[PDB]
């Protein structure tokens, strides 16, 4: 069945759809499956399955229904590009507070359309959200502004936050876990649970939280510096998340505002993120995106990009989200991913297809992680252009030859080197911990700095 | 860095790992990227990023940590097969009730390993859960048994539940929506919200629920038969889900046990499914998997298959989940998908790699949906072997030439035909609504039964 | 929840999993927290199941939370010694609904990975159906143990 006449209107202008402010726009890279309809026909059926229609006409359809049809307004079969306009009336709203839910945006714009039999693949690269819909999203309630304040930094451009992940990913019992925390904090600011760390039988949650709380007090008393921790509170059960969050804050007491909450937002889902966002709005919401690679990878032609995930996360209210190393680390990623960072930090930014005004909605911090160490940092910052962010280096810190504390300081000095505009090798002469990172990871040193041994 | 010696032990035997009952087993189809390590090295790194390790050695590692390492115990580079054993101690547990969470299973077994730079792609096709871990999951609290009981059917092999989806997907205002419900119920049993239907501004939640409740009462009084409805209560906010569920049960009153709760479990996440499962254990939990196609499609080489999704859903506690049309409908799917149904319905069943004993855990109903109609049903049942399930046909019912009521009966008569083992064309002669379905969808009739008009 | 869920915890077949060896901690009242737990440990060396005697709860000489902790210790020690799973049925009976929740929640949190080894006992006849439903609905995943103390006032054939 051909549904082009109803669900496609290429005479529509994007500038007018945007100016109207009554449509969510979504840009897909789509290719029809072979043996079915052409591009516009497939795009039309795509729009139908994403709004008001099914695979056949139904008698129950009326004119009011047609008014809220999602419309294909622009196609480019040569570049496999497809743009669809979704009337904002389609998207579900909370009965309790009239606010928007990302779950509805997902169900419509990238739901059933991913299982279409006449489609080979389709993947969202960008979307635009107008003011009337944008202002209905929670947005972040806590930002890096609040972490900077705890560290005693300026609340505007407070600078680089030295971070790490406790490694091993799993296996440390409560006190050995806390000992690694104390060590790193002697040189660093920020520590986060590795994503699966929680209430394993060999490391009970409450015992670990107490041990870490003790370590924070000892580290802070020792260094005279404020220290931060990001606890994983991910769970299937909403009430388990509350139980964990409430215990952590009560346990840390006067250090409660030094605490961030980590949520495995991609595998646990938006529901888990919102649980954290709404139950603990005064605590930095740390969005961990474990599993995202199943769709965000360029190897995947389905789902949505990392850029889309990151943009959605800001609406959901993540205080910060992992954006990747932009090709400088161990995970898949490219230098062009810097655009993702700008989209979640700025009040106005360009996506791959749409320009987005955020209307003063708070920013989401780019959390940089994945095989980072002191050696790889200068290059990363060159590509990004700033260091006002959190970077966590698990292996990069605890893999340091002189231990976690030295590892922390190497990360600190690595960033100091970049802002100083100094030569890292020349810089190493006057900064031991940074110099010792060359010996900690000689293969990285050999490729990045070919003749470091001579100096 | 080569981590094979630690994270790979091919001398381990699967039969013994299963007999041990201390390991979750996962079977992946993985291909290393070019320019990195070989297959076993990559598989070893995979296990490391999926359990205890990172991309470099850390000083904090001890012998206890090694004891809980995930181990690559079987590989087949020719078939790109990789099997990994996860010690069950790795997986997170609720502090509040000591029970398991699927979120932890996801974070470890298909989390960060999907973003690895040295891997081209990796996708889980099967997993095994031993008794000690299995019994810690919620499992379903309500089954089709409870819907059969409400319909007045036998609680054992109570038979086919005629269902539909209210179409248009969106656009119907409260009363026209309820009118369509009334019409279908004149011939059918079961109605579900189309996945995005909730609290749209043109169709307020509370207004729609009240109108549908009225339709149920009128239809039941008219036909003298019990009728069922599955309401979408999906939301980002846990408390929005509670509010929707509570209002529905209170509104329907003495028909409250006629209500199922639908959750968009893939896009809203496991957290949303558990909210419904635990808040409303006495209400049939209807798992809608919108968006799953982004990873489950055979076109995707990442994430996990529909089989894995469905098996997980049973652990999560879905009363029923969409399993697809198995190649007989509009969506991507194959005839071999019958194995998925058996895995969630039987107490013992075979996966593509692992045999699973469920230890009396309740079954999850296979919900058949996606471009189905009366004509396509006999073929589907032939492949499955039974009709003890819910089938919903949106277009197939409301696309019927004589309307939804006639549409319902065509679905009813279609299954009666298969149950009687009669010839559909011959059967149609004595059953009009079924016969009229041929004219409703002539292309399907022409392809399935080439010479139907003469008779 | 049914006996099937207890059989599963014991590692028994979920169909006709067989006889569950049980006892009641005696004296009915009088044992302090650790002596209570010691008796639990002793019985578990040969048995499967232990229940609070019906009035045992939060007596001043045997505080609830202290006893629960000591019993959890006994279960872990017994299980490590015997290599067998052990069960306990805790009395959570109370006039106050929220007292019942508090007792149940504390027990499950305390036992942690052994939480599914826990049953909840309710004096359903004297406390009433309201108390039984509190447990049934608050803790549907925990075996609900109905104790009928006082029933004889009407159930006896001597009563008409
Ligand atoms: O588990 C890990 O691998 C990490 O702790 C990195 O460890 P290392 O610093 O030791 O490499 C992070 O969770 C990943 O960076 C997540 O990736 P992303 O930020 O792309 O979501
Ligand atoms: O919105 C829809 O398309 C449906 O209501 C079917 O409508 P029709 O009956 O009109 O085809 C179902 O949600 C899909 O079947 C989901 O697919 P799956 O079960 O594969 O997850
Ligand atoms: Mg991590
Ligand atoms: Mg639907
Ligand atoms: Mg007694």
From Swiss-Prot, chain C:
This is Ribulose bisphosphate carboxylase. The gene is cbbM. Mg(2+) binds at residues 51, 53-54. The lineage of its organism: Bacteria, Pseudomonadati, Pseudomonadota, Alphaproteobacteria, Hyphomicrobiales. The active site is at residues 26, 147. The basic functional RuBisCO is composed of a large chain homodimer in a 'head-to-tail' conformation. In contrast to form I RuBisCO, the form II RuBisCO are composed solely of large subunits. Substrate binds at residues 28, 148. RuBisCO catalyzes two reactions: the carboxylation of D-ribulose 1,5-bisphosphate, the primary event in carbon dioxide fixation, as well as the oxidative fragmentation of the pentose substrate. Both reactions occur simultaneously and in competition at the same active site. Signal peptide: none annotated. It comes from Rhodopseudomonas palustris (strain ATCC BAA-98 / CGA009). Belongs to the RuBisCO large chain family. Type II subfamily. Homodimer. The modification N6-carboxylysine is found at residue 51. It comes from the Bacteria.
């Amino acid at each position: 069945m051909d549904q082009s006449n109803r669900y496609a209107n290429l005479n529509l202008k994007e500038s007018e759809l945007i100016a109207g402010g009554r449509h969510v726009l979504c840009a897909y890279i789509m290719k029809p499956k072979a043996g079915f309809g052409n591009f516009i026909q497939t795009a039309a059926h795509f729009a139908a399955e994403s709004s008001t229609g099914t695979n056949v006409e139904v008698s129950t359809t009326d004119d009011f229904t047609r008014g809220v049809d999602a419309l294909v307004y622009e196609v480019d079969e040569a570049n496999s590009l497809m743009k669809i306009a979704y009337p904002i009336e389609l998207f579900d709203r909370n009965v309790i507070d009239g606010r928007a839910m990302i779950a509805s945006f997902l169900t419509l714009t990238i739901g059933n359309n991913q299982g279409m039999g006449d489609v080979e693949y389709a993947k969202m690269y960008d979307f635009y959200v107008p003011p009337a819909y944008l202002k209905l999203f929670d947005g972040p309630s806590t930002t890096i502004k609040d972490l900077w304040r705890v560290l005693g930094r300026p609340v505007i451009n407070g600078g680089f936050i030295v971070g790490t992940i406790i490694k091993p990913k799993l296996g440390l019992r409560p006190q050995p876990f806390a000992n690694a925390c104390y060590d790193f904090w002697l040189g660093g600011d920020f520590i986060k649970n590795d994503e699966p760390q929680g209430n394993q039988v060999f490391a009970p949650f409450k015992d670990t939280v107490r041990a870490v709380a003790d370590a924070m007090r000892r580290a802070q008393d020792k260094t005279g510096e404020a220290k931060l921790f990001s606890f994983n509170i991910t769970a299937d059960d909403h009430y388990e998340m509350l139980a964990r969050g409430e215990f952590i804050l009560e346990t840390f007491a006067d250090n409660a505002d030094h605490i961030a909450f980590l949520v495995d937002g991609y595998v646990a889902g938006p529901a888990a993120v919102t649980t954290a966002r709404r139950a603990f709005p005064k605590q930095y919401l740390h969005y961990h995106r474990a599993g995202h690679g199943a769709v965000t990878s360029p190897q995947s032609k389905r789902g949505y990009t990392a850029f889309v995930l990151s943009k959605m996360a800001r609406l959901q209210g993540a205080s910060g989200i992992h954006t990747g190393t932009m090709g400088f680390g161990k995970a898949e990623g490219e230098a062009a991913d810097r655009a993702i960072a700008y989209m979640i930090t700025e009040d106005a930014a360009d996506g791959p297809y749409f320009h987005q005004e955020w209307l003063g909605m708070n920013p989401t911090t780019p959390i940089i992680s994945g095989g980072m160490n002191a050696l790889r940092m200068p290059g990363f910052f060159d590509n990004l252009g700033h260091s006002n962010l959190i970077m966590t280096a698990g292996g990069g810190a605890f893999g340091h030859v002189d231990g976690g504390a030295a590892g922390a300081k190497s990360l600190r000095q690595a960033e100091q080197c970049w802002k100083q505009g100094a030569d890292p090798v020349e810089f190493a002469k006057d900064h031991r911990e940074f110099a010792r990172a060359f010996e900690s990871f000689p293969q990285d040193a050999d490729k990045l700095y070919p003749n470091w041994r001579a100096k």
